[PDB]
Amino acid sequence: KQYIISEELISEGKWVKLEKTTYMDPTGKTRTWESVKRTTRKQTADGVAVIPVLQRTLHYECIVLVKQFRPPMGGYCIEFPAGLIDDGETPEAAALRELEEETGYKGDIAECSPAVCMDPGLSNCTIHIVTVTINGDDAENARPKPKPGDGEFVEVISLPKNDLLQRLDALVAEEHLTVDARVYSYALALKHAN
Amino acid sequence: KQYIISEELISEGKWVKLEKTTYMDPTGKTRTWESVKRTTRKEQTADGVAVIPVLQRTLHYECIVLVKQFRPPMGGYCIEFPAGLIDDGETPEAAALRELEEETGYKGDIAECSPAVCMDPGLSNCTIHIVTVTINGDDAENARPKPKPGDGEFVEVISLPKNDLLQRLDALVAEEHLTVDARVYSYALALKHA
Ligand SMILES: Cc1nn(Cc2c(C)noc2C)c(=O)s1
Ligand SMILES: [Cl-]
Ligand SMILES: [Mg+2]
Numbered sequence: 001k002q003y004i005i006s007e008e009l010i011s012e013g014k015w016v017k018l019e020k021t022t023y024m025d026p027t028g029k030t031r032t033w034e035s036v037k038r039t040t041r042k043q044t045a046d047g048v049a050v051i052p053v054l055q056r057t058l059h060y061e062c063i064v065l066v067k068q069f070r071p072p073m074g075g076y077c078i079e080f081p082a083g084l085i086d087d088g089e090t091p092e093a094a095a096l097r098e099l100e101e102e103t104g105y106k107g108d109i110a111e112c113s114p115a116v117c118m119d120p121g122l123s124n125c126t127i128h129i130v131t132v133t134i135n136g137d138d139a140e141n142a143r144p145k146p147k148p149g150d151g152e153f154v155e156v157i158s159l160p161k162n163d164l165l166q167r168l169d170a171l172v173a174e175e176h177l178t179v180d181a182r183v184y185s186y187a188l189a190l191k192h193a194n
Numbered sequence: 195k196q197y198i199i200s201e202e203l204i205s206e207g208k209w210v211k212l213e214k215t216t217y218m219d220p221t222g223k224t225r226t227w228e229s230v231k232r233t234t235r236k237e238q239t240a241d242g243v244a245v246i247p248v249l250q251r252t253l254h255y256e257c258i259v260l261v262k263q264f265r266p267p268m269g270g271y272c273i274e275f276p277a278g279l280i281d282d283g284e285t286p287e288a289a290a291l292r293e294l295e296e297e298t299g300y301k302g303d304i305a306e307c308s309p310a311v312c313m314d315p316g317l318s319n320c321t322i323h324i325v326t327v328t329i330n331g332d333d334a335e336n337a338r339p340k341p342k343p344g345d346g347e348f349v350e351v352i353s354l355p356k357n358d359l360l361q362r363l364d365a366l367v368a369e370e371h372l373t374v375d376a377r378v379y380s381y382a383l384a385l386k387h388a
């Protein structure tokens with residue numbers, strides 16, 4: 001019933017644009033929206049984010065997260081490894097690459113989501129959430145070498161999956177980090193399950 | 195180590211602005227970033243709220259109440275937790291309970307409320323509180339609930355069993371063109387992974 005009639009460029013940068021979208025609401029009334037897009041995307045989606053399950057025997061499973069200064073937030077955020085999918089890359093390979101670049105972890109794909117929206121009231125940005133396990137007992141993951149590209153500065157933080165929500169609350173409580181929404185959402189459902 | 199140096203306005207819309215952010219990188223080098231921000235955020239601890247509404251109902255499996263709406267930035271229908279912006283002076287819990295009633299008709303009870311969490315921190319400063327709310331579906335208030343959508347709001351309620359949420363979401367994505375929100379998908383993945 002609803003649909004786009006037109007888009008108007010308001011402002012373009014090297015990475016992000018701001019558009020004015022005209023849409024038909026369901027009553028047959030024309031309406032406007034200020035919408036944000038990435039300039040970079042071709043791709044099944046803009047990005048991937050990796051849920052990395054570190055499995056070591058005789059240890060808790062951990063979820064592997066990254067801390068990065070995020071200039072939009074003006075502070076440090078805890079997030080799932082993530083980055084944009086390069087032209088002609090597959091969502092899975094982007095996942096394994098970014099996981100390796102940001103953590104040093106060599107991992108295995110378990111499952112891959114369809115494209116999911118990041119903030120659909122504001123942007124069109126989408127990602128593939130890619131669940132990956134990490135055999136933490138394999139010698140290649142024994143002393144993992146994070147290979148950040150230019151401009152990235154990433155600290156790795158592994159947290160036990162069985163207490164993930166409580167561990168994140170402590171980090172917010174004490175470190176004044178911002179936790180990412182998808183991460184928090186995952187941590188919550190761990191608690192809410194069953 | 196890192197911190198903001200200056201933020202220069204690039205373009206201001208009615209509800210969204212683009213900014214050129216200058217920050218210090220952790221090598222002591224000045225770098226810049228293009229940032230998206232809302233123009234609405236006042237004293238609100240976050241821009242918005244999203245509600246994780248657990249519909250509880252005697253001799254029913256617990257459901258997660260979701261909404262389906264046209265999202266202009268996306269040019270399509272999206273499945274999301276109930277959500278809205280926090281009004282000036284409104285508490286996040288108060289906004290969650292009001293947005294949930296407006297969008298679904300259900301009258302909830304607060305369970306918990308997150309710190310402010312970042313929506314898409316490589317692109318924006320946007321934050322939310324993720325507020326968990328239980329709905330007593332046995333209560334007669336919650337019997338045949340009527341959405342009260344505001345001006346230009348057109349919302350469909352989709353209640354899906356917690357114990358089968360991801361497969362039920364995958365099923366809906368299978369049968370039509372629509373995107374699942376990443377926080378909903380993340381929570382559905384954690385329910386499978388626990
Ligand atoms: C009132 C508000 N409405 N919105 C949503 C919106 C956006 C984004 N562009 O057009 C509209 C309308 C806010 O962000 S404050
Ligand atoms: Cl797993
Ligand atoms: Mg990244």
Ligand SMILES: [Mg+2]
Pocket residue numbers: 082083098101102149152
């Ligand atoms: Mg990277």
Ligand SMILES: [Mg+2]
Pocket residue numbers: 276277278297
């Ligand atoms: Mg809403």
Ligand SMILES: [Mg+2]
Pocket residue numbers: 277278293296297347
């Ligand atoms: Mg609303």
